[PDB]
Curated annotation (Swiss-Prot), chains A, B:
Reported modifications of this chain: Glycosylated. Phosphorylation at Tyr-135 and Tyr-136 by SRC leads to an increased calcium influx through the channel. Probably dephosphorylated at these sites by PTPN1.
ANK repeat residue numbers: 18-48, 52-81, 90-119, 136-165, 169-210, 212-241
Compartment(s): Cell membrane
GO molecular function term, any single one: metal ion binding
UniProt note on tissues of expression: Expressed in duodenum, proximal jejunum, cecum, and colon.
Region annotated Interaction with calmodulin, chain positions: 67-77
Full-protein positions shown: 67 to 677 of 767
Region entry Interaction with S100A10, spans: 554-558
Known catalytic reactions: Ca(2+)(in) = Ca(2+)(out)
Designated name of the protein: Transient receptor potential cation channel subfamily V member 6
Species per Swiss-Prot/TrEMBL record: Rattus norvegicus (Rat)
Length: 594, 594
């Protein structure tokens, strides 16, 4: 008995009471004579409320009967004010129904009789829910703006409709227009509502924010309304001059940039689950913005921070390729003949000769891990991937390094399990740096594979080495040497080598786990390659393959700008103050036309 | 603080000084009364220079104010001559601004007052740089030809505009027109400028070359301007006769052929990084040219030179399959039990019985290598691949043969390393010979794979044989025989055989290197195959797959014609001298129309 089933039952139940009540039936059928033979002579009590708490006038307004409505208003002018007392339509008056149906004569008549232009239809039907086919708001002015009836709109303002009115979701009439399907026609209606504003700079209707802190301009970008966005952009751009085909226009660049508490358009576009907002970046005030962010400041800091990461990880493996080794003191090798451990645990490290060199290497692996946690853990409190899952991996990597540290200081046997996870987590997070025209697009996506593949093998050969650095190399000796390890793992990448298989000997728990993940990633990269080899030249889907990368580059650029300090990464555009336009920062864009 | 940021600041700074200076503001706002209330009565000093070193007339010219400009010229006729004293617009007069905006009345008025039609706008904005949205030149005549205003063009010639004028890049008005987006409309403007030429055969405006030695016709081909190219081709073709649908036209074929110092159109098309010029080859005077070059002379000499290469390489392997062998004199085999060398060094060669047969074979491998260097090393001094990287490989191959020679005469142990590189470099450079309708296109690209694959295995099986010709065949005996070697390497091509793997035995350094390159090339050829199997029938992209090969065939044809001597490869077309048209060589082309 879902909700809907209820309204399905009520809509059927409404038509039943309309069938049953002759006053309500006559109001529906527009039976003029039957309304006089009922109201004037032993006529039913007028204030009848139907199945949906509707009056006879409500029914008269629903079906566009003006003759029958006018009879009901002259016999009982009280009704006009009565709202729908039902739960589905709590607050809806006969004026709401008259406005939506674009019954100008009935609207004009109800306004004559003094209908409330401020009545809030707070019924459950009018809620902004995916199970409601329309969302127009609460006030009757808001209904007229959505049906596109400019006649009713001004006719409502003439009778004192407050354009600043907000509904239960803190949405002005401007917010609701941007949430409408007919975008190209709502632009016209949007200008009509702005004309009736107070005409004052202060308390502007375009500035009144959503209950979720969204001005209509900002909501247009988050909702992916291209038509309303470009239209709203006209009010906030200034043409400096026109030199032949060139047009140097100056953009406002205010609500489209940082230093919103978190309120940047850019941050709202990259963090929303609306794909449709992906396209807002690509508009002519915004695309120029992020491309300049990325050219200088963006691309260099990414490669610098990336190169630092490359060194911080190659140092971690430098400490892993040479980790403390002990012999199999134990004779237990002889029992469990399957066992092939030459197990190493050592706390002989303190006395040091080529041991201290690692220690400072291990110390770097720790101070970098906490630094990683010092910049990402305070960031989860204030979560989307577009960039890629770099942040999820970068914290779990430092988690494994800290565990391996806590694994040490206890001389625990399972040192390998958390230490091996950090190897793949560390390196595979390197190929996220990979971020730094159909053919050129074939070669572009191919170099990303060569980048991702060499990165994967440098994390799994590193891992596979540790897995078998303890075990006997006479049986299952694929990785006796890092150099071999690399070359074996490389060949294992392409299925050329029957991967490391033994069955008489009990191989450690890690291999059967680390190799299973290696076998999957190696095929996905070989599958992500084929799609990049066909998908590039198969259609203009390449562009689809394309923005996504550009959208990822933008998502990364916004990330860099959040922690990097103010001294680095200066603000975009040019500030306006002396030069004399100014507190807002402006972007200078010039375009050629042909 | 990039350059651009500067001009972004200056354009904002200009509008500030315009805001600040009432004379400059009135010149912008076209305030006629405010210009009289300032110049006639205690008016500001006129020769005010703005933020961009601009006069009030410059500002008056920028925004199309004629009433305000006429006031400034009658109150101070001096201004007309003043150029922009700024660095961004050094040299720009008010006439330049009037010409671009197509303000005929202001142009006519400035010419009345005697404006310089030879003023060079040498500012940094007007430079031919990718960060400038337009490039029109320096002189005001050159501005009018680019905006398409034929009225201003002739109006400038009437006042003595030199059509032969060249800018800082040695570009005539003809050169600049070909560098314009609107190609179909610039053809019309191009004819208007030619009419005012001296009318003499000598000192023709179409013959005045670029500062980079490019006539406008030649520049059209290098820039890939199809519309200007076909248009300029009309002036240099002659219709012999018309026999029904047939039309035997005779083409000039002068600036489109060799014996330019290096100045052939063809050499300029094949060596430029402009893809767009790829399409110039395919025009109806040029496509007929290269196809005749290729049919006879081109295709045969390529196969002849190719067959010679095939023999010169099969001889090098003939000396490599049977190279001096010595035993492991040393007991060192017993130490380093991993070592599996039956190492051969010998200087017993001099005494000879089936040894001399190789020596003359080795001697051929040397005289051919220097001959290779005798034809490519003097060619680097006077670098693009289209043909493919054949030249880069052919020199490094001879480099390895010379090293192997220097490796000999020293009895060095590492003989194998440079000698094995020459094997793959020699053979894989053979499949460049591969150069010699969707389905037929499927079978066409498939035979190139069968050509490239058999060539690859004949270079790596040759290499793998040498790598294990010294090592023990009882362990890792994939290549004990060239015949086996071939068959193993063939199977290793298709991943059928777990490639040569051993871990108890220390395999030589080369295998882990030569096999890694074999594993990559074998997959790319199996990936270049799939794209040729789908890409052929997936769309008319096959053509895209297609010209590229035709463009490579043309690039190879131009290569052959450079070193081959004059006695071979006669000149294309027919010479004109008695027959009596002549010093230029002409190509006879007849076309049917339907
Ligand atoms: C037709 C019903 N009868 C009536 O008197 N009011 C209702 C109007 C239906 C509108 C439902 C709008 C929505 O889907 O939210
Ligand atoms: C508008 C500026 N003000 C002015 O007096 N001259 C400038 C003209 C701008 C042209 C820039 C051409 C280019 O991009 O190179």
């Amino acid at each position: 008995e879902s909700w809907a089933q209820s309204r399905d039952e009520q809509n059927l139940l409404q038509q039943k009471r309309i069938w049953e009540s002759p006053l309500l039936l006559a109001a529906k059928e527009n039976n003029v004579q039957a309304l006089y033979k009922l109201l004037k002579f032993e006529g039913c009590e007028v204030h009848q409320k139907g199945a949906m708490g509707e009056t006879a006038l409500h029914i008269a307004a629903l079906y566009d009967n003006n003759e029958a409505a006018q009879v009901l208003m002259e016999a009982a002018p009280e009704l006009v004010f009565e709202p729908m007392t039902s739960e589905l339509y709590e607050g809806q008056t006969a004026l709401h129904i008259a406005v939506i149906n674009q019954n100008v004569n009935l609207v004009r008549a109800l306004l004559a009789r003094g209908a409330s232009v401020s009545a809030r239809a707070t019924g459950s039907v009018f809620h902004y829910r995916p199970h409601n086919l329309i969302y127009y708001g609460e006030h009757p002015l808001s209904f007229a703006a959505c049906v596109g009836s400019e006649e009713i709109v001004r006719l409502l303002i003439e009778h004192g409709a407050d354009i600043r009115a907000q509904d239960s979701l803190g949405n002005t009439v401007l917010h609701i227009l941007i949430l409408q399907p007919n975008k190209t026609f709502a632009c016209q209606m949007y200008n009509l509502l702005l004309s009736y504003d107070g005409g004052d700079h202060l308390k502007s209707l375009e500035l009144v924010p959503n209950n979720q802190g969204l001005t209509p301009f900002k909501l247009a970008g988050v909702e992916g309304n291209i038509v309303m966005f470009q239209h709203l952009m006209q009010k906030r751009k200034h043409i400096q001059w026109t030199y032949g085909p060139l047009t140097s226009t100056l953009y406002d660049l205010t609500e489209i940039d940082s230093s919103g508490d978190d309120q940047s358009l850019l941050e709202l576009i990259v963090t929303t689950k609306k794909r449709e907002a992906r396209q807002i970046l690509d508009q002519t005030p915004v695309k120029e913005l992020v491309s300049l962010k990325w050219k200088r400041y963006g691309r260099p800091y990414f490669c610098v921070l990336g190169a630092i990461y490359v060194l911080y990880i190659i140092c971690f493996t430098m400490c892993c390729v040479y980790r403390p080794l002990k012999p199999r003191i134990t004779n237990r090798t002889n029992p469990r003949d399957n066992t092939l451990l030459q197990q190493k645990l050592l706390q002989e490290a303190y006395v040091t000769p080529k041991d201290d060199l690692r220690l400072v290497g291990e110390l770097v692996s720790i101070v970098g891990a906490v630094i990683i946690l010092l910049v990402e853990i305070p960031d989860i409190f204030r979560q989307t991937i577009l960039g890629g899952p770099f942040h999820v991996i970068i914290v779990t990597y430092a988690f494994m390094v800290l565990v391996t540290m806590v694994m040490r200081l206890t001389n625990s046997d399972g040192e390998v399990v958390p230490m091996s996870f950090a190897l793949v987590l560390g390196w595979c997070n390197v190929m996220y740096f990979a971020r730094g025209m159909i053919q050129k697009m074939i070669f572009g996506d191919l170099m990303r594979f060569c980048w991702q593949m060499a990165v994967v093998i440098l994390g799994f050969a590193s891992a596979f080495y540790i897995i078998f650095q303890t075990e006997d190399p006479d049986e299952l000796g694929h990785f006796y040497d890092y150099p071999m390890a690399l070359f074996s793992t490389f060949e294992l990448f392409l299925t050329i080598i029957d991967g490391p298989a033994n069955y008489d000997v009990d191989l450690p728990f890690m291999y059967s786990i680390t190799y299973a993940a290696f076998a999957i990633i190696a095929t996905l990269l070989m599958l992500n390659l084929l799609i990049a080899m066909m998908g590039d030249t198969h259609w203009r889907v390449a562009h689809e393959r394309d923005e996504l990368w550009r959208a990822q580059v933008v998502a990364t650029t916004v990330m860099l700008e959040r922690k990097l300090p103010r001294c680095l990464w200066p603000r975009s555009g040019i500030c306006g103050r002396e030069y004399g336009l100014g507190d807002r920062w402006f972007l200078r864009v010039e375009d050629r036309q042909d």
